[PDB]
Short mmCIF file of C-alpha atoms and ligand atoms in Angstrom, two decimals:
data_model
loop_
_atom_site.label_atom_id
_atom_site.label_comp_id
_atom_site.label_asym_id
_atom_site.label_seq_id
_atom_site.Cartn_x
_atom_site.Cartn_y
_atom_site.Cartn_z
CA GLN A 1 -28.31 -2.07 -10.71
CA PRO A 2 -26.11 1.61 -10.68
CA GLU A 3 -22.37 0.86 -10.43
CA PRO A 4 -20.87 2.04 -6.91
CA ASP A 5 -18.15 5.35 -7.48
CA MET A 6 -16.87 4.19 -3.63
CA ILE A 7 -16.85 1.36 -2.22
CA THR A 8 -15.30 -0.04 1.95
CA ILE A 9 -12.21 -1.79 1.97
CA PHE A 10 -11.58 -4.08 4.87
CA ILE A 11 -7.84 -4.82 5.68
CA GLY A 12 -6.77 -6.81 8.87
CA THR A 13 -3.00 -7.88 9.85
CA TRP A 14 -2.25 -10.83 12.33
CA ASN A 15 0.73 -12.58 13.30
CA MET A 16 -1.12 -15.66 15.03
CA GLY A 17 1.99 -16.47 17.18
CA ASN A 18 1.93 -19.99 15.05
CA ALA A 19 -1.28 -21.26 17.80
CA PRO A 20 -5.39 -21.69 16.21
CA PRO A 21 -6.78 -18.21 16.72
CA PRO A 22 -10.26 -18.37 19.82
CA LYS A 23 -14.06 -20.01 18.80
CA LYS A 24 -14.90 -15.87 17.85
CA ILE A 25 -12.42 -13.27 15.89
CA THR A 26 -16.20 -10.77 15.29
CA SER A 27 -14.38 -8.04 17.02
CA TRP A 28 -11.45 -7.69 14.56
CA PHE A 29 -13.92 -7.58 11.37
CA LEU A 30 -16.17 -5.43 13.53
CA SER A 31 -12.95 -2.84 14.03
CA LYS A 32 -13.41 -3.09 17.50
CA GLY A 33 -11.48 -2.27 20.48
CA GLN A 34 -9.09 0.19 20.83
CA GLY A 35 -8.26 2.95 19.23
CA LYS A 36 -10.85 4.71 16.00
CA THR A 37 -12.79 2.08 16.11
CA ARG A 38 -15.86 1.59 14.12
CA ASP A 39 -20.02 3.05 15.34
CA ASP A 40 -22.13 0.25 16.58
CA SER A 41 -24.86 1.25 14.09
CA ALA A 42 -22.19 -0.16 11.32
CA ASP A 43 -22.16 -3.92 12.70
CA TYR A 44 -24.55 -5.40 9.84
CA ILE A 45 -23.49 -3.40 7.21
CA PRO A 46 -20.69 -5.46 4.95
CA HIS A 47 -17.87 -4.07 3.68
CA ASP A 48 -16.83 -4.64 -0.19
CA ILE A 49 -14.37 -5.96 -0.07
CA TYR A 50 -11.52 -8.13 3.62
CA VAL A 51 -8.88 -8.80 2.94
CA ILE A 52 -6.76 -10.43 5.32
CA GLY A 53 -3.01 -11.18 5.99
CA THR A 54 -1.75 -13.07 8.68
CA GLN A 55 1.78 -14.21 10.24
CA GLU A 56 2.88 -17.44 11.77
CA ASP A 57 -0.54 -18.86 10.55
CA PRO A 58 -0.21 -22.58 11.60
CA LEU A 59 -3.49 -23.22 9.41
CA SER A 60 -4.14 -24.76 6.52
CA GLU A 61 -5.70 -22.50 3.94
CA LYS A 62 -9.24 -24.51 4.23
CA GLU A 63 -9.35 -24.35 8.36
CA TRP A 64 -8.66 -20.73 7.34
CA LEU A 65 -11.59 -19.86 4.83
CA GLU A 66 -13.69 -22.21 7.21
CA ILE A 67 -12.93 -19.76 9.94
CA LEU A 68 -13.38 -16.69 8.24
CA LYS A 69 -16.34 -16.78 5.80
CA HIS A 70 -18.15 -18.20 8.79
CA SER A 71 -16.95 -15.21 10.95
CA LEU A 72 -18.59 -12.30 8.16
CA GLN A 73 -21.46 -14.67 7.60
CA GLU A 74 -22.51 -14.51 11.30
CA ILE A 75 -21.86 -10.83 10.94
CA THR A 76 -23.50 -9.14 8.55
CA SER A 77 -25.70 -12.78 7.39
CA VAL A 78 -23.68 -12.70 3.52
CA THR A 79 -21.51 -15.96 2.38
CA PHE A 80 -18.97 -14.09 0.85
CA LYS A 81 -17.00 -15.12 -2.25
CA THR A 82 -12.99 -16.28 -2.22
CA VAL A 83 -11.00 -13.69 -4.51
CA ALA A 84 -7.89 -15.52 -3.23
CA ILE A 85 -5.74 -16.84 -1.23
CA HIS A 86 -1.56 -16.90 -1.40
CA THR A 87 1.05 -18.39 1.35
CA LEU A 88 3.75 -18.61 1.05
CA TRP A 89 5.38 -20.52 5.03
CA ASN A 90 3.55 -18.83 7.58
CA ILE A 91 2.60 -15.79 5.85
CA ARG A 92 -0.99 -15.89 4.38
CA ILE A 93 -3.21 -13.11 2.07
CA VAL A 94 -6.65 -14.65 1.98
CA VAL A 95 -8.91 -11.88 -0.64
CA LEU A 96 -13.01 -12.20 0.15
CA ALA A 97 -16.17 -10.01 -1.62
CA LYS A 98 -19.38 -9.91 -1.56
CA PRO A 99 -21.33 -11.82 -4.26
CA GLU A 100 -22.37 -8.14 -6.36
CA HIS A 101 -18.94 -7.99 -6.96
CA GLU A 102 -17.39 -11.20 -8.87
CA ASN A 103 -18.58 -9.94 -12.30
CA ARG A 104 -16.85 -6.57 -11.17
CA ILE A 105 -13.54 -7.81 -10.42
CA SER A 106 -11.63 -10.03 -12.71
CA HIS A 107 -7.48 -9.29 -13.48
CA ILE A 108 -6.78 -11.73 -9.64
CA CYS A 109 -2.80 -12.09 -9.96
CA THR A 110 -0.85 -12.87 -6.43
CA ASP A 111 3.03 -13.36 -5.86
CA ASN A 112 5.24 -13.35 -3.38
CA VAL A 113 8.12 -12.58 -2.79
CA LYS A 114 10.61 -14.32 -0.25
CA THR A 115 13.68 -11.80 1.94
CA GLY A 116 16.95 -12.33 2.62
CA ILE A 117 19.84 -14.69 1.68
CA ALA A 118 21.14 -17.48 3.65
CA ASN A 119 20.76 -17.92 7.01
CA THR A 120 17.96 -15.15 6.18
CA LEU A 121 15.74 -17.11 3.66
CA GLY A 122 13.05 -18.86 5.01
CA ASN A 123 10.53 -17.29 6.51
CA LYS A 124 10.49 -14.24 6.22
CA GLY A 125 8.87 -12.35 3.05
CA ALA A 126 6.05 -10.54 1.53
CA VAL A 127 2.09 -12.00 0.52
CA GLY A 128 0.55 -10.07 -2.24
CA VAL A 129 -2.46 -10.11 -4.30
CA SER A 130 -4.03 -7.48 -7.01
CA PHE A 131 -6.82 -7.31 -8.76
CA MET A 132 -9.30 -4.71 -11.18
CA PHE A 133 -12.14 -3.37 -9.47
CA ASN A 134 -14.99 -2.06 -12.58
CA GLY A 135 -12.08 0.23 -13.77
CA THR A 136 -10.13 0.26 -10.65
CA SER A 137 -6.50 -1.31 -10.70
CA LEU A 138 -6.29 -2.58 -5.79
CA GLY A 139 -3.47 -3.77 -4.99
CA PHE A 140 -2.77 -5.50 -1.52
CA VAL A 141 0.52 -6.49 0.10
CA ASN A 142 0.85 -8.35 3.81
CA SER A 143 4.76 -8.65 4.46
CA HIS A 144 6.31 -10.80 7.69
CA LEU A 145 9.63 -8.02 7.75
CA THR A 146 12.98 -9.20 10.20
CA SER A 147 12.32 -9.80 13.65
CA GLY A 148 14.60 -7.90 16.09
CA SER A 149 15.35 -3.71 17.62
CA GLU A 150 18.41 -3.40 16.26
CA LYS A 151 17.37 -4.65 12.77
CA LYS A 152 16.15 -1.35 11.13
CA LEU A 153 17.98 -0.69 8.12
CA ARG A 154 16.89 -5.11 7.64
CA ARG A 155 13.09 -4.44 7.64
CA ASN A 156 14.00 -1.60 5.14
CA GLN A 157 16.36 -4.01 3.26
CA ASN A 158 12.85 -6.52 3.30
CA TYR A 159 10.30 -2.96 1.68
CA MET A 160 13.01 -2.80 -1.19
CA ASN A 161 13.24 -6.07 -2.10
CA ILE A 162 9.35 -7.07 -1.28
CA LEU A 163 8.30 -3.71 -3.78
CA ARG A 164 10.62 -4.40 -6.63
CA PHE A 165 10.55 -8.01 -6.85
CA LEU A 166 6.80 -8.81 -6.38
CA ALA A 167 4.94 -9.32 -9.83
CA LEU A 168 1.16 -7.91 -9.35
CA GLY A 169 -1.12 -5.68 -11.47
CA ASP A 170 -0.51 -4.91 -15.28
CA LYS A 171 3.24 -6.33 -17.04
CA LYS A 172 2.96 -3.67 -19.55
CA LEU A 173 3.37 -1.80 -17.13
CA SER A 174 7.38 -2.75 -17.39
CA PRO A 175 9.62 0.98 -15.39
CA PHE A 176 6.74 0.57 -12.60
CA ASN A 177 7.19 -1.29 -9.96
CA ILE A 178 4.12 -2.05 -6.66
CA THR A 179 4.70 1.20 -5.94
CA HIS A 180 3.11 2.40 -8.39
CA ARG A 181 0.99 -0.20 -10.10
CA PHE A 182 -2.33 0.65 -8.73
CA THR A 183 -4.66 3.22 -8.51
CA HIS A 184 -4.67 1.93 -4.19
CA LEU A 185 -1.85 0.11 -2.67
CA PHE A 186 -2.53 -1.54 0.61
CA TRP A 187 0.92 -2.46 2.92
CA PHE A 188 0.18 -4.35 6.08
CA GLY A 189 1.53 -6.54 8.24
CA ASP A 190 3.94 -7.55 10.34
CA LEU A 191 6.43 -5.04 9.51
CA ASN A 192 7.81 -5.44 13.00
CA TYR A 193 9.08 -1.92 13.49
CA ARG A 194 9.90 -1.88 17.72
CA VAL A 195 9.97 1.49 19.78
CA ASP A 196 13.15 2.25 20.24
CA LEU A 197 13.89 3.34 24.51
CA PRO A 198 16.17 1.56 26.24
CA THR A 199 15.73 -1.89 28.10
CA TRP A 200 15.83 -0.55 31.31
CA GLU A 201 13.33 1.67 30.34
CA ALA A 202 10.44 -1.85 30.34
CA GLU A 203 8.88 -1.22 32.87
CA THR A 204 8.91 2.69 32.33
CA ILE A 205 7.33 2.01 28.83
CA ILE A 206 4.37 -0.45 30.74
CA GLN A 207 3.18 2.43 33.07
CA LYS A 208 2.86 5.11 29.52
CA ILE A 209 1.05 2.90 28.25
CA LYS A 210 -1.46 1.69 30.75
CA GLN A 211 -1.82 5.34 30.98
CA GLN A 212 -2.99 5.86 27.21
CA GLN A 213 0.16 7.81 26.60
CA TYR A 214 1.18 7.26 23.14
CA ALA A 215 3.30 10.54 22.28
CA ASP A 216 6.05 9.87 24.10
CA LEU A 217 6.56 6.24 22.52
CA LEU A 218 5.14 6.88 18.84
CA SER A 219 7.92 9.49 19.16
CA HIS A 220 10.53 6.45 19.05
CA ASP A 221 8.58 4.26 16.47
CA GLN A 222 11.70 3.28 14.43
CA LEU A 223 8.00 2.88 11.12
CA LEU A 224 7.65 6.66 12.18
CA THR A 225 11.11 7.76 12.54
CA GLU A 226 12.14 5.70 9.49
CA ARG A 227 9.38 6.95 7.49
CA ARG A 228 10.88 10.95 8.55
CA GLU A 229 14.14 10.12 7.32
CA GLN A 230 13.07 8.68 4.30
CA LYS A 231 14.34 5.42 4.19
CA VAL A 232 11.61 3.52 4.59
CA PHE A 233 8.08 3.56 2.79
CA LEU A 234 8.56 6.92 0.94
CA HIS A 235 4.69 7.87 -0.56
CA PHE A 236 3.09 5.17 1.52
CA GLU A 237 0.48 7.27 4.50
CA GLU A 238 -0.28 5.84 8.10
CA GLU A 239 -2.96 6.85 9.87
CA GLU A 240 -2.65 8.55 13.43
CA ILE A 241 -2.13 4.97 16.02
CA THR A 242 -4.54 5.51 19.26
CA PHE A 243 -4.96 2.02 19.75
CA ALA A 244 -1.79 0.21 21.84
CA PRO A 245 1.27 -1.55 21.06
CA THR A 246 0.01 -5.36 19.86
CA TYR A 247 3.48 -7.33 21.15
CA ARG A 248 4.57 -8.65 22.57
CA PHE A 249 1.56 -9.49 25.21
CA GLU A 250 1.43 -13.03 27.98
CA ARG A 251 -0.88 -15.57 25.54
CA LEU A 252 -4.68 -16.03 26.95
CA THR A 253 -4.51 -12.42 28.74
CA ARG A 254 -4.06 -8.71 27.11
CA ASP A 255 -2.88 -7.43 30.87
CA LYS A 256 0.44 -8.32 30.19
CA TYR A 257 3.47 -7.04 28.54
CA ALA A 258 5.91 -10.53 27.16
CA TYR A 259 9.15 -8.34 26.97
CA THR A 260 12.05 -9.94 29.03
CA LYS A 261 14.97 -12.13 27.17
CA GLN A 262 14.11 -15.43 27.42
CA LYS A 263 16.11 -18.59 25.76
CA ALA A 264 12.46 -18.91 24.08
CA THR A 265 13.70 -14.72 22.27
CA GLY A 266 17.27 -15.56 21.22
CA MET A 267 18.08 -13.42 24.93
CA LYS A 268 15.94 -10.66 23.29
CA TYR A 269 14.17 -8.12 24.44
CA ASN A 270 10.81 -7.52 22.69
CA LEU A 271 9.32 -4.21 23.91
CA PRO A 272 6.53 -3.13 23.50
CA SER A 273 5.97 -2.23 20.27
CA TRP A 274 4.19 -1.23 17.36
CA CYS A 275 4.91 -4.08 14.52
CA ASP A 276 1.04 -4.67 12.99
CA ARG A 277 0.61 -2.00 10.91
CA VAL A 278 -1.38 -0.76 7.42
CA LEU A 279 0.09 1.43 5.33
CA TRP A 280 -1.61 3.24 2.47
CA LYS A 281 -1.07 4.98 -0.98
CA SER A 282 -3.34 6.25 -3.69
CA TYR A 283 -2.82 8.02 -6.47
CA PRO A 284 -3.00 12.30 -6.81
CA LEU A 285 -6.26 13.12 -5.36
CA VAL A 286 -7.87 10.14 -5.53
CA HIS A 287 -11.03 9.56 -3.20
CA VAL A 288 -9.15 7.12 -0.14
CA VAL A 289 -11.15 8.40 3.58
CA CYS A 290 -9.76 5.55 6.57
CA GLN A 291 -12.56 4.85 8.82
CA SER A 292 -10.83 3.16 11.41
CA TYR A 293 -7.38 1.87 12.30
CA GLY A 294 -6.87 0.27 15.98
CA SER A 295 -6.66 -3.59 17.28
CA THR A 296 -8.94 -5.73 19.32
CA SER A 297 -8.72 -6.56 23.16
CA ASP A 298 -10.42 -9.34 23.22
CA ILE A 299 -8.10 -12.40 20.18
CA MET A 300 -6.16 -13.01 22.94
CA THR A 301 -4.35 -16.48 21.57
CA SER A 302 -0.99 -14.92 20.23
CA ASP A 303 1.40 -12.65 21.53
CA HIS A 304 0.18 -9.71 19.00
CA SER A 305 -2.98 -8.21 18.61
CA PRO A 306 -5.22 -8.65 15.71
CA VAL A 307 -5.16 -4.79 13.93
CA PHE A 308 -8.17 -3.24 11.65
CA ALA A 309 -8.51 -0.79 9.38
CA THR A 310 -11.07 0.71 7.26
CA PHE A 311 -11.05 2.28 4.16
CA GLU A 312 -13.49 3.77 1.75
CA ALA A 313 -12.15 4.10 -1.83
CA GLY A 314 -13.14 5.52 -5.17
CA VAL A 315 -13.92 3.47 -7.78
CA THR A 316 -14.38 4.04 -11.29
CA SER A 317 -16.65 2.70 -13.73
CA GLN A 318 -16.02 -0.03 -16.88
CA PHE A 319 -15.95 2.94 -19.31
CA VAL A 320 -17.65 2.56 -23.00
CA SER A 321 -18.31 5.24 -25.40
CA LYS A 322 -18.88 4.77 -29.36
CA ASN A 323 -14.84 5.13 -29.94
CA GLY A 324 -12.63 4.18 -27.92
CA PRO A 325 -12.04 1.25 -26.56
CA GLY A 326 -10.51 -0.47 -29.95
CA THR A 327 -10.09 2.98 -31.02
CA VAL A 328 -8.97 7.01 -30.19
CA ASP A 329 -12.07 9.99 -29.80
CA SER A 330 -10.06 12.81 -31.66
CA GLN A 331 -12.06 15.71 -29.01
CA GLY A 332 -9.56 14.10 -26.22
CA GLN A 333 -6.41 15.39 -26.33
CA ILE A 334 -3.52 15.77 -23.86
CA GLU A 335 -0.32 17.68 -23.75
CA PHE A 336 3.08 18.68 -22.37
CA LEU A 337 4.09 22.69 -21.85
CA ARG A 338 7.60 23.52 -20.64
CA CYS A 339 8.29 20.61 -19.03
CA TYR A 340 12.10 18.95 -17.15
CA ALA A 341 12.84 16.51 -14.72
CA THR A 342 15.36 16.99 -12.16
CA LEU A 343 17.65 14.09 -11.75
CA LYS A 344 19.40 13.05 -8.73
CA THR A 345 21.76 10.89 -11.40
CA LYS A 346 25.78 11.44 -11.30
CA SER A 347 25.44 10.16 -14.88
CA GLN A 348 25.37 11.54 -18.11
CA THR A 349 23.48 9.92 -21.82
CA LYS A 350 20.76 11.70 -23.39
CA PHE A 351 17.27 10.96 -21.61
CA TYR A 352 13.33 9.85 -22.71
CA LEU A 353 9.70 9.65 -21.25
CA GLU A 354 7.65 6.73 -20.94
CA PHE A 355 4.19 7.70 -21.18
CA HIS A 356 1.79 4.10 -19.73
CA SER A 357 -2.04 4.73 -18.77
CA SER A 358 -5.08 2.94 -18.79
CA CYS A 359 -6.37 5.77 -21.28
CA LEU A 360 -4.10 5.90 -23.86
CA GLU A 361 -4.51 2.19 -27.02
CA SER A 362 -0.53 2.16 -25.37
CA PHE A 363 2.30 3.66 -24.15
CA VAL A 364 3.75 6.60 -25.37
CA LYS A 365 7.94 6.96 -26.55
CA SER A 366 8.96 10.84 -25.84
CA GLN A 367 12.27 11.87 -28.48
CA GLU A 368 15.54 12.67 -25.88
CA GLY A 369 15.30 15.53 -23.47
CA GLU A 370 18.12 17.76 -23.37
CA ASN A 371 20.50 18.40 -20.78
CA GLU A 372 21.76 21.19 -18.86
CA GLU A 373 23.48 21.56 -15.15
CA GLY A 374 20.94 23.13 -12.52
CA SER A 375 23.12 25.78 -10.85
CA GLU A 376 22.76 23.50 -8.19
CA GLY A 377 25.32 20.50 -9.28
CA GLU A 378 21.08 18.81 -11.27
CA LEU A 379 20.99 17.15 -14.29
CA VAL A 380 17.92 19.22 -15.56
CA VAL A 381 16.55 16.97 -18.66
CA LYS A 382 14.23 19.57 -20.88
CA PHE A 383 11.60 18.96 -23.09
CA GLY A 384 10.17 22.06 -23.84
CA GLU A 385 7.18 22.26 -25.93
CA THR A 386 9.01 18.70 -27.76
CA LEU A 387 6.73 15.81 -26.18
CA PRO A 388 4.04 14.12 -27.51
CA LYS A 389 0.56 14.64 -27.91
CA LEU A 390 -1.89 12.15 -25.30
CA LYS A 391 -4.40 10.31 -27.85
CA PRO A 392 -6.65 9.53 -25.64
CA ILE A 393 -9.34 6.24 -26.49
CA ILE A 394 -11.88 7.62 -24.27
CA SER A 395 -13.05 11.88 -24.20
CA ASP A 396 -15.59 12.43 -21.84
CA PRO A 397 -14.18 14.57 -19.04
CA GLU A 398 -16.82 12.35 -16.54
CA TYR A 399 -14.77 9.94 -18.19
CA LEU A 400 -11.04 11.42 -18.39
CA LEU A 401 -11.31 14.32 -15.74
CA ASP A 402 -10.28 10.33 -13.61
CA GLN A 403 -7.66 9.47 -15.35
CA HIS A 404 -3.69 9.31 -14.45
CA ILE A 405 -0.62 8.75 -16.36
CA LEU A 406 2.48 7.37 -15.44
CA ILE A 407 6.01 9.05 -16.51
CA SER A 408 8.95 7.12 -16.54
CA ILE A 409 12.99 8.92 -16.99
CA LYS A 410 14.09 5.93 -19.59
CA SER A 411 18.40 6.28 -20.10
CA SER A 412 18.77 6.26 -23.87
CA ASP A 413 21.83 4.41 -23.39
CA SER A 414 20.11 1.65 -21.22
CA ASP A 415 16.98 1.38 -21.73
CA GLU A 416 16.55 1.59 -18.10
CA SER A 417 14.47 3.71 -15.50
CA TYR A 418 16.09 6.62 -13.62
CA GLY A 419 13.07 7.57 -11.96
CA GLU A 420 9.03 7.10 -11.73
CA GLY A 421 6.07 9.00 -11.33
CA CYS A 422 2.15 9.68 -11.78
CA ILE A 423 0.23 12.94 -13.06
CA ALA A 424 -3.85 12.88 -11.94
CA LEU A 425 -5.75 14.25 -14.84
CA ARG A 426 -8.30 15.73 -12.24
CA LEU A 427 -7.31 19.69 -13.01
CA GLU A 428 -8.96 23.05 -11.86
CA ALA A 429 -9.86 23.45 -15.54
CA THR A 430 -9.85 21.96 -19.22
CA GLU A 431 -8.06 23.92 -22.75
CA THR A 432 -5.71 25.33 -19.77
CA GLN A 433 -2.44 25.51 -19.39
CA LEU A 434 -1.96 24.35 -15.40
CA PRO A 435 0.92 22.98 -13.38
CA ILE A 436 2.20 19.59 -13.23
CA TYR A 437 3.86 17.86 -10.67
CA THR A 438 5.82 14.31 -9.16
CA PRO A 439 8.41 13.16 -7.40
CA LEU A 440 10.14 10.32 -8.86
CA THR A 441 11.23 7.71 -8.00
CA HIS A 442 13.59 3.92 -8.73
CA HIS A 443 13.36 1.18 -6.44
CA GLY A 444 10.97 3.46 -4.56
CA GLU A 445 13.70 5.60 -3.48
CA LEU A 446 13.16 9.62 -4.86
CA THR A 447 15.89 9.60 -7.91
CA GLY A 448 14.05 13.45 -9.12
CA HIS A 449 10.89 15.71 -9.36
CA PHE A 450 9.37 15.96 -12.85
CA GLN A 451 7.21 19.26 -13.84
CA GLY A 452 5.21 21.07 -16.19
CA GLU A 453 2.09 22.77 -17.01
CA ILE A 454 -0.25 20.42 -19.04
CA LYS A 455 -3.60 20.74 -21.27
CA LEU A 456 -6.43 18.34 -21.57
CA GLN A 457 -9.16 18.78 -23.94
CA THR A 458 -12.04 16.39 -23.23
CA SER A 459 -15.46 16.79 -25.06
CA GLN A 460 -17.31 18.98 -23.63
C1 O0P B 1 -14.98 -15.01 -11.28
N1 O0P B 1 -13.45 -13.92 -12.08
C2 O0P B 1 -13.72 -12.08 -11.33
C3 O0P B 1 -14.08 -13.64 -9.12
C4 O0P B 1 -13.89 -14.70 -8.89
C5 O0P B 1 -13.94 -15.28 -7.84
C6 O0P B 1 -14.64 -15.25 -6.85
C7 O0P B 1 -13.67 -13.53 -6.87
F1 O0P B 1 -15.88 -12.70 -5.98
C8 O0P B 1 -14.47 -12.47 -8.07
S1 O0P B 1 -12.71 -13.38 -13.14
N2 O0P B 1 -13.67 -12.13 -13.73
O1 O0P B 1 -12.85 -14.99 -13.22
O2 O0P B 1 -11.54 -13.34 -12.52
#
């Protein structure tokens, strides 16, 4: 039975509005409704992994698991295994997998982050799950961010707190947050970004939605505009939105948007908005293709419609050779030439690099670089030809060209990371000097760049 080189992943996000679901929710898991929808000919084909994020979920874990498992069994005739379930208040994540995958999955982690302070601590935050699927690390975050059209900055703050403090994946990757720990990271939820147009334009917006003319609305979507100004979700992707806004509906129909201010809304308008989103970030040159992104039309218990996204995602096998794991394979090496970091920091300390990768027995510390002043004010840290030669555990190119090297640039004075990035070993050539590049981030904000050349030796 061969190990897969691809799997499909279903991501669902639904703010349930504190109401039980209707008796049938299969349209959600089938990616049917509005937007980029799944072909009917695929309906019986199970996804490999289903990740369900809910917000304002009134159900017990048991109650929701029974609904989810029975739904998938009706669609696929497969009884899915429960990988993980984690709930913070009314924010929940469930991971289900085909039974054939049970012994491909390991290192299952769950965590949560509560956002805000005092007033603003008590119902917003995130839950997440991570695990290994054979040689591939997968992370999943379901976040319910701060509500309200005039709180985009708070949402951006909520995002940074979640990616700093959610403790998922390999704890040995100590300098790296969740935005660097996974081959594929999926972040979804009620992100609560709104269409920023005047209140007086509410009926105009509704008109535009009835015409399926989303362009002038999406140009005011706060998540798109904040992401274009590099304020949030830097280096994440989102599929084009081709479905109507998923909030705020009158319950038990989808014919009416309920946008007017009410005591129940704290006298706030809720103009139609794309609150409910799915984004991802995968390591460079790993296969990931969005195959659906849309909303259901037939699930109407909530003031939100469910959102679905499906993905093809490249995966690798748990590689064994006669040498590694448990030793190095002297036929393999990774060399770095003419490397330098450019940092935005105003500080003057010495810097060194750490190289982290599951192709190494453990992480590698470099010598300190040489600081110079850049022509436009910047700190340039030069490593020249001084970087250590990295000794991978396995030299086979079928393994090594699929791996990645995480880089942290750290202060010698404090040992704190000033920037993190990732280099793919999926090179155009081996035994050949080739350009490499990564942006560097810290707390998910841009802090610099790392560039240079790589020379990869494999057993071929
Ligand atoms: C048996 N584990 C993985 C798993 C647990 C539950 C459901 C699964 F589909 C897979 S393990 N290797 O101990 O983490």
